[PDB]
PDB file of C-alpha atoms in Angstrom:
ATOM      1  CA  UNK A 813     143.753 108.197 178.113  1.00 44.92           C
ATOM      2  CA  UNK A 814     142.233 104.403 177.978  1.00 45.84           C
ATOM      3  CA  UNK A 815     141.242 104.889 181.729  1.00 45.05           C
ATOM      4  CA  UNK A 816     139.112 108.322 181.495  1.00 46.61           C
ATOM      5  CA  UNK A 817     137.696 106.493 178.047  1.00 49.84           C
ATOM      6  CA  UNK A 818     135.732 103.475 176.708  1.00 52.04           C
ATOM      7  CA  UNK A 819     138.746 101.308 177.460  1.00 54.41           C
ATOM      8  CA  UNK A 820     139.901 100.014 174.309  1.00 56.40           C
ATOM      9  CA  UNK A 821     142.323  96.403 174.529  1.00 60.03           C
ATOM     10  CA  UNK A 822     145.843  98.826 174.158  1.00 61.12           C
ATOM     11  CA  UNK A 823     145.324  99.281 170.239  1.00 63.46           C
ATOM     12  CA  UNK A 824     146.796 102.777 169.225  1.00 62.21           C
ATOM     13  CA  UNK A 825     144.716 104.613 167.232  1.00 64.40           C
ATOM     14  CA  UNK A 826     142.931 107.980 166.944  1.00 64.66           C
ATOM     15  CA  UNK A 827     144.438 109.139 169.871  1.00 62.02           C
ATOM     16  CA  UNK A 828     141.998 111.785 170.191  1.00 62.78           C
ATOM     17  CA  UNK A 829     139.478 111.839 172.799  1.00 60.78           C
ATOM     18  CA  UNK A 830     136.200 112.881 170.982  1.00 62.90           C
ATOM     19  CA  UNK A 831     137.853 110.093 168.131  1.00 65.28           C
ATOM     20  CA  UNK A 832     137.811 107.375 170.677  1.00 66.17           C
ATOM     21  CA  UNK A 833     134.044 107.318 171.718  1.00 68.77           C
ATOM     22  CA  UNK A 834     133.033 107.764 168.061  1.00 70.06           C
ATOM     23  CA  UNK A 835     135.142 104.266 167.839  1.00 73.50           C
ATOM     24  CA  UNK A 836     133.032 103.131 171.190  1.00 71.47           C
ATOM     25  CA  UNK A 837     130.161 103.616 168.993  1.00 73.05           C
ATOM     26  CA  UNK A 838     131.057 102.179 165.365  1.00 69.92           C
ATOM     27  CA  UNK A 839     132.790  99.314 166.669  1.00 72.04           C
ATOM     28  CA  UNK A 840     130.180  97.610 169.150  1.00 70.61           C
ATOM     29  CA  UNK A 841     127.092  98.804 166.694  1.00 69.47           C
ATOM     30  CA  UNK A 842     125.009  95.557 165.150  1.00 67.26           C
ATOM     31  CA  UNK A 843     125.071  95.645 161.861  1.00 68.46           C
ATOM     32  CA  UNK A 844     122.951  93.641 160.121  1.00 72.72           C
ATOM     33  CA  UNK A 845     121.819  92.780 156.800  1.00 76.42           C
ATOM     34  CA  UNK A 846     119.492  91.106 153.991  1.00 74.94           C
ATOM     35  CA  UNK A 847     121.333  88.213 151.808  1.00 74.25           C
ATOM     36  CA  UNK A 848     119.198  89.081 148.708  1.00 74.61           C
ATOM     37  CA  UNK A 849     121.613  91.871 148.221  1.00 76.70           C
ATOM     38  CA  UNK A 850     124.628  90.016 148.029  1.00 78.46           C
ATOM     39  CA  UNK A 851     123.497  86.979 146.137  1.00 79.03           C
ATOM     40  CA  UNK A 852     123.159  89.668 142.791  1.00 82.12           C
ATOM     41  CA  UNK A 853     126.935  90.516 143.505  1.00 83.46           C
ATOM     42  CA  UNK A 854     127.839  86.757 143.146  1.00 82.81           C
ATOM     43  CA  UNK A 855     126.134  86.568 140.151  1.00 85.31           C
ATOM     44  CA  UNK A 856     127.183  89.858 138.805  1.00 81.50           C
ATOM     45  CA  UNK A 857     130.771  88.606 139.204  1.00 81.25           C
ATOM     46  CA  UNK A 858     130.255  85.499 137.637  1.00 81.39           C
ATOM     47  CA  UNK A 859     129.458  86.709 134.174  1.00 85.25           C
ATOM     48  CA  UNK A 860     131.861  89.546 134.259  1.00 87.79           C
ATOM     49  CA  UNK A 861     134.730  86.864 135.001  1.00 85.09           C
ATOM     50  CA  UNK A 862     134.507  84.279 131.881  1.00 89.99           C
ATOM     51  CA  UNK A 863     132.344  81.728 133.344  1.00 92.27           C
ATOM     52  CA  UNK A 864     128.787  82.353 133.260  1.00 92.06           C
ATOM     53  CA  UNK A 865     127.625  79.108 132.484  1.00 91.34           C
ATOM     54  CA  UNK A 866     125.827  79.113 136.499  1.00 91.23           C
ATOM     55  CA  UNK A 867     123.776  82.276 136.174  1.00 91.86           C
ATOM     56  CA  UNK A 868     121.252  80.296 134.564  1.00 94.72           C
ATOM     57  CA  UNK A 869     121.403  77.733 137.550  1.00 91.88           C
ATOM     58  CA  UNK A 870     121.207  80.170 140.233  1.00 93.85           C
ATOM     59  CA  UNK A 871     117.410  81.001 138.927  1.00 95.32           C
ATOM     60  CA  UNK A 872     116.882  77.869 141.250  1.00 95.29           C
ATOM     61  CA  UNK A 873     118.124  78.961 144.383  1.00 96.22           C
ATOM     62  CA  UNK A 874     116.565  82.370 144.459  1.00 96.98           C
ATOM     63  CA  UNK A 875     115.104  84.741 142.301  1.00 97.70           C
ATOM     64  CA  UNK A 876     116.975  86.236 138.957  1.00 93.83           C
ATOM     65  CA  UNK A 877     115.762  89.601 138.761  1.00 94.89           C
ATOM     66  CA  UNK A 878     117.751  91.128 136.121  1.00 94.92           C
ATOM     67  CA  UNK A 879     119.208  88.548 133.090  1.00 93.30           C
TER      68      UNK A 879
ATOM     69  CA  UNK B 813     148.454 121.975 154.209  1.00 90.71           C
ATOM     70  CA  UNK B 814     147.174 120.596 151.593  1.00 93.24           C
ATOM     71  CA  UNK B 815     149.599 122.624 149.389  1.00 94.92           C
ATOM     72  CA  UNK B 816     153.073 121.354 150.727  1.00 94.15           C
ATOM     73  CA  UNK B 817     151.836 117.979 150.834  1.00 94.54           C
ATOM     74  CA  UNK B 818     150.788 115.420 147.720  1.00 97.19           C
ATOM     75  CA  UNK B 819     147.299 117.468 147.484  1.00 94.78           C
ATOM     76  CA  UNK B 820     144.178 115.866 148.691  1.00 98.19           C
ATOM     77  CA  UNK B 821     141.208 116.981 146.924  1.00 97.66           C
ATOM     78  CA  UNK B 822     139.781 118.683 149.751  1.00 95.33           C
ATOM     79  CA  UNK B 823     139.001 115.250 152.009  1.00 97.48           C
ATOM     80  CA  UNK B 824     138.875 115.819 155.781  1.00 95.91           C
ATOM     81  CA  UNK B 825     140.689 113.146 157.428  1.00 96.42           C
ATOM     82  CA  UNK B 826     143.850 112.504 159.286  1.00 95.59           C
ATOM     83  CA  UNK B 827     145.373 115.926 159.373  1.00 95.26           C
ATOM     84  CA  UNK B 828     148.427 114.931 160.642  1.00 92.60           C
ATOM     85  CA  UNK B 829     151.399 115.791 157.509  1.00 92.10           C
ATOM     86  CA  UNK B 830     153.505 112.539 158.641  1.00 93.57           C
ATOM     87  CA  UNK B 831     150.073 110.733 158.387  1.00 93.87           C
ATOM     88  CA  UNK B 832     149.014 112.726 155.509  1.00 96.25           C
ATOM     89  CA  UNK B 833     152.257 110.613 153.016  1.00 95.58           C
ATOM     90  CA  UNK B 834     151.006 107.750 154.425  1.00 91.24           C
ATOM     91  CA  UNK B 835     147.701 108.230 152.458  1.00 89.54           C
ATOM     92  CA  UNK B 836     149.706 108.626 149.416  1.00 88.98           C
ATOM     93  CA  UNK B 837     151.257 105.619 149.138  1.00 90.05           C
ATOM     94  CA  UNK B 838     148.468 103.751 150.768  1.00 87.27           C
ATOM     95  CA  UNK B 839     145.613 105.041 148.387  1.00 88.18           C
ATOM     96  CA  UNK B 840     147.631 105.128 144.855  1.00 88.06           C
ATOM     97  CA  UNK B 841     149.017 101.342 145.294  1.00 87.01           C
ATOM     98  CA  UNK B 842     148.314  99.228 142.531  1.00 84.52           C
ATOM     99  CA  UNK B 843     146.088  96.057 144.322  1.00 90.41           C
ATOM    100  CA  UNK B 844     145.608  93.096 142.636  1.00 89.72           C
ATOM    101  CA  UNK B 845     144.736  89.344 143.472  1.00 92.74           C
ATOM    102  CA  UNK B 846     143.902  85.755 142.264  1.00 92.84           C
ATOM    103  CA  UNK B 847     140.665  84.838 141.356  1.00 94.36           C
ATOM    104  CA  UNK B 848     140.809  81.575 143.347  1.00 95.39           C
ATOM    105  CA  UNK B 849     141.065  82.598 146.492  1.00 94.13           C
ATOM    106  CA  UNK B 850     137.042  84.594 146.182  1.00 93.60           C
ATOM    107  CA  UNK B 851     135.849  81.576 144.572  1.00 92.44           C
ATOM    108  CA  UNK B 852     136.380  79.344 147.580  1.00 90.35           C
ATOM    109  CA  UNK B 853     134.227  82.152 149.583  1.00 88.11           C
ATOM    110  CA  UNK B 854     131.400  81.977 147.260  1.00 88.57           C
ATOM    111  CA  UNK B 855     131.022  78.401 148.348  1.00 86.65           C
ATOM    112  CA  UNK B 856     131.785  78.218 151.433  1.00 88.15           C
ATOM    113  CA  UNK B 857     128.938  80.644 151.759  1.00 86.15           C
ATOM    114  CA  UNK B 858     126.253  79.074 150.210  1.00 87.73           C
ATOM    115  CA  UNK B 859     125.996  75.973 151.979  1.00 86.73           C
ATOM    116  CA  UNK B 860     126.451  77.968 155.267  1.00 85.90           C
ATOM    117  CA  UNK B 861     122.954  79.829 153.773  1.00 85.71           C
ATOM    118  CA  UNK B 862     120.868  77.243 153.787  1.00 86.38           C
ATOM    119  CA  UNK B 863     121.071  77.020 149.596  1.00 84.04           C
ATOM    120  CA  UNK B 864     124.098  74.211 149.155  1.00 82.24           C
ATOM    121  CA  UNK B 865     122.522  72.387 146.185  1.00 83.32           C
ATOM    122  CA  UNK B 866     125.011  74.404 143.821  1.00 82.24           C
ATOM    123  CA  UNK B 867     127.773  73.391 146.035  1.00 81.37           C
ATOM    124  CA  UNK B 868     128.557  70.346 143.415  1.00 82.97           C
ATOM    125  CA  UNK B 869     127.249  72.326 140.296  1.00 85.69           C
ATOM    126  CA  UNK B 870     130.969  74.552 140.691  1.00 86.18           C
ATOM    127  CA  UNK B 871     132.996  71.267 140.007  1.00 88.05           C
ATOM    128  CA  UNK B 872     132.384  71.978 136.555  1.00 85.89           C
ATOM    129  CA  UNK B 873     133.563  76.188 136.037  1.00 87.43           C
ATOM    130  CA  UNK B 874     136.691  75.788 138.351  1.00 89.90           C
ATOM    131  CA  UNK B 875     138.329  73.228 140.970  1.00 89.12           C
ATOM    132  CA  UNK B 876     136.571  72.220 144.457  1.00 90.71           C
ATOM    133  CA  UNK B 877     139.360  71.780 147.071  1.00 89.46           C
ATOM    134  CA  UNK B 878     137.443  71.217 149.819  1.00 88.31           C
ATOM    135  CA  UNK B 879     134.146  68.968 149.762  1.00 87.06           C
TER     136      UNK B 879
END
C-alpha cells in the first residue's frame, strides 16, 4: 500500500487509501502564522494564573489591546 | 454502532468498534500538568522573537533556570 501511495516512512496509520493522500496533503502543507495572536494568549494566561504583575510590562513590547 | 458502543454524539471518525473504546478512554482522561514546565516556553520564546528585554523582568514572578 506505501508503494502505489505517497510513500509514507513505515508509520501505520489510516490504512485507507483515500486516508493516506489526505495525510500527503495535511502533513507537507505550510502553515504559517502572525505572532500578534499568540502574544494575547501569553498574557491572557498570565493574569488568569496568580501573577499578573507583567501584563502591565508587556505594554512595552507590543501593543495591549484589551486591559 | 453507535448504540452497542460508549455512544458518540453523532461524530464521524474512526469507525472501527475496537478503535471506537479507544476514544473512550482517550477523550474522558482526566489531563493535568505543572505550571513550570509552560513557563520556561514563554521565555524561551520571546527572546527567539526578537522582544527579549522581558527575559530578566520573569526573575521576579517565578524562577529562571536557564539564562
Amino acid at each position: 500500500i506505501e508503494r502505489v501511495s505517497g510513500k509514507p516512512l513505515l508509520i501505520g496509520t489510516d490504512v485507507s487509501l483515500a486516508r493516506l493522500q489526505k495525510a500527503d496533503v495535511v502533513a507537507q502543507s505550510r502553515i504559517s502564522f502572525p505572532e500578534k495572536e499568540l502574544l494575547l494568549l501569553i498574557r491572557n494566561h498570565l493574569i488568569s494564573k496568580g501573577l499578573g504583575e507583567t501584563a502591565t510590562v508587556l505594554t512595552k513590547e507590543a501593543d495591549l489591546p484589551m486591559t
